[PDB]
A paper describes a structure:
Pseudomonas aeruginosa is an opportunistic pathogen that causes persistent infections in humans. Randomized transposon mutagenesis screens had indicated several genes from the diaminopimelate (DAP) biosynthetic pathway to lysine in P. aeruginosa as essential, suggesting the corresponding gene products as potential targets for new antibacterial drugs. Tetrahydrodipicolinate N-succinyltransferase (DapD) catalyses the transfer of the succinyl moiety of succinyl-CoA to the α-amino group of tetrahydrodipicolinate, the first committed step in the succinylase branch of the DAP biosynthesis pathway present in most Gram-negative bacteria and mycobacteria.
D-2-aminopimelic acid is not accepted as a substrate by PaDapD, but acts as a very weak inhibitor (IC50>20 mM). Eventually, these complexes could be prepared by soaking of monoclinic crystals of PaDapD in crystallisation liquor, where succinate had been replaced with either L- or D-2-aminopimelate. D-2-aminopimelate is bound to PaDapD in an extended conformation, well defined in the electron density maps. In five of the six active sites in the crystal asymmetric unit the interactions of this ligand are identical. The ε-carboxyl group of D-2-AP forms hydrogen bonds to the guanidinium groups of the two arginine residues Arg181 and Arg193, and the appropriate orientation of the side chains of these residues is ensured by a salt bridge to the side chain of Asp168. The head α-carboxyl group is anchored to the protein by hydrogen bonds to the main chain amino group of Ala226 and the side chain of Asn209. The α-amino group of the ligand is within hydrogen bonding distance to one of the carboxylate oxygen atoms of Glu221. We therefore suggest that binding of D-2-AP in a conformation incompatible with catalysis is the underlying basis for the discrimination of the enzyme against this stereoisomer of 2-aminopimelate.
Author numbering:
A (entry chain C): 3 to 244, 251 to 329
B (entry chain B): 3 to 244, 251 to 294, 297 to 328
C (entry chain A): 3 to 246, 251 to 294, 297 to 329
């Protein structure tokens, strides 16, 4: 059948050969049968979703079997035949719940390489499949083995820097897509879709399965599953929430430290320092600022051209059209 | 006497022999008399709270002394004996206001290894004992010597990365306690207590002498001296203040960008985007009115639900 | 003429000889005619604003020329003479809109070395002269060359760390000014002015062409073009508005509470309540605490000794003189 995805990965394993992470230089959405027929008899692949650990010799086999077909995947596999780490040709048949850390890592590479957009990928059950790892300057270190390597570094007058301890690495250690700025790459997880013309400032955050159409100025927090449409501005410290799936529309402006708990339609504005939730009651207005009625914000969710603001004289949350 | 604490460290000194930081691989709280008796003669330790420098040769002597007493300390000493960096043995008879840089570091270590909890140790006058230090990829660097090292790196087409300039280092370059998540480790100082099951996200922060029993999802700012009970939450970008001892009870929820200037009791609730302090007047409820009181008075009461009324801007509590 | 500035730099170039960044150890504001006379012939410098590449051999000639005029610059040039990286000598007759990457970098160096203050240097058109770059543990890497290197690191079992993708690098990687703490150096850009006796906590942020006179605790976000006067405080997570209209500045001895936000220039000894956000149009209940009139915040901008606050019983935004 027509594969969902395939990728030749180079990862790291804990002392017991359990995977900690895997790097995928050039992952493919819907590979071609000519690439797949070449490698398929080599991987000992038959069908399904398989994470097939393979050898340095086979890397030379594959590099050859792709001479003529897909030079980049071929040139990728030449390089991988020199690899000091272990290899995992991962081949998915369907967009299905991951059944491996190694497939989990492939699937996060698709969002980040922009090969798929948020929610175009099954990330049901993924958390159990991502070992909580020490992210350090030498790479991935298993939590059980850390203190050891920390001490040895100190003896040699050196430092083993531990810059995150989480089940997600930061995206940029695997991929920086085109036209992107990220001031503090600690703040953007792998699995984030950062669209062309997006500038994530130091105060911005972007979770896995979440992000920006591009362009956009993100100075606030983009929660898991949230998507921000083109032309939008998230101000400093502003919050989105992670039931209902929060989204932001096109040309929206969210002021500094504002909070949104409802979907914002296109060309929406939210005043700095205003937190709106689904249950928050809002004093609706008309083309003037005469009252029309009071309503719950949930019932304004998705509406275009709204201006949410706090009346400073009576503490009333207003909305203008 | 029975020692409060002891630990064998490897640290860094500046050209003028002043200590910048100390790394303690296995600090001991209430070390047995057997260990102390084996180690005191070699160190020159008689009494009190002391940061005693010791030599590569003394490391071998100590290693042998602790064979048949404590294997783990004996093995550390064997590693230590091979060090390229100066060694210090910190023996504290009592828990008192620190009297050295090495002692201060040891006491931050006791918190971050979870051997003691926030407020359990005397940290009075710690600030002067913790030199402001450039934290870099090669290790700790003295501010007076940094600009020269920065230059030399660029000549070799290398970078001397200066990722913090402060008196406290980040915790995880010394210690990662069990069952712990920290999204961005710049955000947790050495001296923070990070309880098992706690996951600290990118916007979460924890100061020294503060932290979490665990579990918890910390996405906000736990100031110095603030402890947060089991199963409590601190949503994105919230804040706690660091006079009156601020804490958070068990099973509590705190909203995003909210701010607590009072000690919240068990199972308390604060609204997202809602800041309260000890002087902010709140409308108490039963939601019929009872009386307008200052949040300082409710401080400690369990099972509350703080909120801001979206029509009249009134701060309320139920 | 008298030069506005000159500086000798060692920098990084991409494959096509384009500058990615320049490091200046000892930049000079208003350098002597004696220093400029020694170097102008050797560099081929006549006039104008120039960034002239010079050779390792020219470095020796410059070093020799400056023995007896300026020893430190001579001492730097002898170091630069041995360097593994390209050199550039930036000489600027006038403080004007940058015309090269090397010049743009110098001006940010002039700011972060405290040789000039925010708004004392012409920074117009600086975004297009600052190339977007990957800031890694091996230095600056061109975005076009990154993926190849990210691959090679994994194959040697190492990690090329990408800690920022941006047009501005973090300041402390170039210069740490005396008498300063910065908890998380990610949050202070090159071009920041961090006055003596400033602490920037982890949640603090200082953009280029902004900063602090000193002393002061900055736990909140100082935007581009904002200068905070001596002895003032910015609490955890607070906000200033930038202009990227009217330039926002904070006066001396001011207090700004956690999560609060300023959209007006605050005069001396001003105070703002924690969690309170004010803008130019925000209508405020002015007091003496007996009412006087409900006026726009813009008319108070710059006034000394004010105390802005939110009335917790009726939501009213006030200001007690
Ligand atoms: N605010 C939520 C936090 C959810 C934590 C995600 C994790 O467990 O690593 C979000 O941004 O999605
Ligand atoms: N409680 C802390 C205060 C900031 C610490 C400042 C210092 O280390 O000199 C906080 O607001 O998180
Ligand atoms: N809030 C604004 C952000 C300015 C844009 C940041 C950039 O494109 O380098 C400020 O700090 O002034």
């Amino acid at each position: 059948q027509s594969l969902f995805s395939l990728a030749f990965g180079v990862g790291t394993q804990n002392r017991q050969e359990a995977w900690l992470e895997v790097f995928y230089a050039l992952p493919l959405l819907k590979p071609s049968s000519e690439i797949v027929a070449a490698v398929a008899p080599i991987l000992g692949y038959a069908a399904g979703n398989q994470a097939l650990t393979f050898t340095s010799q086979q890397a030379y086999q594959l590099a050859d079997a792709l001479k003529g077909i897909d030079a980049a995947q071929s040139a990728l596999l030449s390089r991988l035949a020199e690899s000091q780490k272990p290899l995992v040709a991962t081949l998915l048949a369907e967009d299905a719940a991951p059944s491996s850390t190694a497939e989990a890592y492939l699937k996060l590479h698709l969002l980040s390489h922009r090969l798929v957009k948020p929610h175009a990928v099954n990330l049901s059950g993924i958390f159990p499949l991502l070992p909580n790892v020490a992210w350090t300057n030498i790479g991935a270190v298993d939590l059980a083995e850390l203190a050891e390597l920390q001490l040895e570094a100190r003896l040699k007058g050196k430092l083993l820097e531990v810059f995150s301890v989480d089940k997600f690495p930061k995206m940029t250690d695997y991929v920086v897509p085109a036209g992107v700025r990220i001031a503090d790459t600690a703040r953007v997880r792998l699995g984030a879709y950062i669209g062309e013309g997006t500038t994530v400032m130091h105060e911005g955050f972007v979770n896995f399965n979440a992000g920006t159409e591009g362009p956009g100025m993100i100075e606030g927090r983009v929660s898991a599953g949230v998507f921000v449409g083109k032309g939008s501005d998230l101000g400093g410290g502003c919050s989105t929430m992670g039931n209902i799936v929060i989204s932001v529309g096109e040309g929206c402006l969210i002021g500094a430290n504002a909070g949104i708990g409802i979907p914002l339609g296109d060309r929406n504005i939210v005043e700095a320092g205003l937190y709106i939730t689904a249950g928050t009651k809002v004093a609706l207005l008309d083309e003037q600022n005469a009252l029309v009625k009071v309503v719950k914000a949930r019932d304004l969710a998705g509406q275009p051209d709204l201006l949410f603001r706090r009346n400073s004289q009576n503490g009333a949350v207003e909305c203008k059209t």
